[PDB]
Amino acid sequence: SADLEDNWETLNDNLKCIEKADNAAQVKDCLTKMRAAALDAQKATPPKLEDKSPDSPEMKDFRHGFDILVGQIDDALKLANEGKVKEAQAAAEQLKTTRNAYIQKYL
């Protein structure tokens, strides 16, 4: 099993994976694992919001950050499927921006 902290580390390890990958098959596995961990983290309650109602604006913001992240991952997967390996890898910068601005502030 995995908790939010575990899934966060999986997400960040596979963000590094995307940046260091050498071919389409590799980036696809990195992006797949990031997407799986993102969906699992999205269902958690982050430490700063444990006193909030589950549908509070803050929890909606937390979850929307992952919806953005998952959309960016899917966009990068499409590029990787098209053989645009370098452009797929470039999504790492924007994934970090989403991660930092939406989710990190709740940990």
Author numbering: 0 to 106
Question: What sentences appear in the manuscript?
Answer:
Previous studies showed that proper introduction of disulfide bonds could stabilize the flexible region of target proteins and reduce the conformational entropy by locking the protein into single desired conformation. Here we developed a comprehensive disulfide bond prediction algorithm that not just increased the success rate of predictions but also improved the quality of crystallized target proteins. We applied our method on two proteins which were previously determined to high resolution and frequently used as fusion partners for GPCR crystallization, cytochrome b562 (BRIL) and Flavodoxin, and verified our prediction by solving the crystal structures of the wild type (WT) proteins and mutants.
The continued disulfide omitted electron densities of the side chains suggested that the disulfide bonds are successfully formed in all crystallized mutants, which are T9C-A36C, A20C-Q25C, V16C-A29C, and K27C-A79C in BRIL and N14C-C93, A43C-L74C, and C102-R125C in Flavodoxin, respectively. These disulfide bonds are located near the middle of helices I and II (T9C-A36C and V16C-A29C) or between helices II and III (K27C-A79C), thus directly strengthened the linkage between these helices. On the other hand, the V16C-A29C and A20C-Q25C in BRIL, the N14C-C93 and A43C-L74C in Flavodoxin have higher entropy than that of WT counterparts, consistent with their relatively lower diffraction resolutions. For BRIL proteins, the simulation B-factors are consistent with the experimental values.
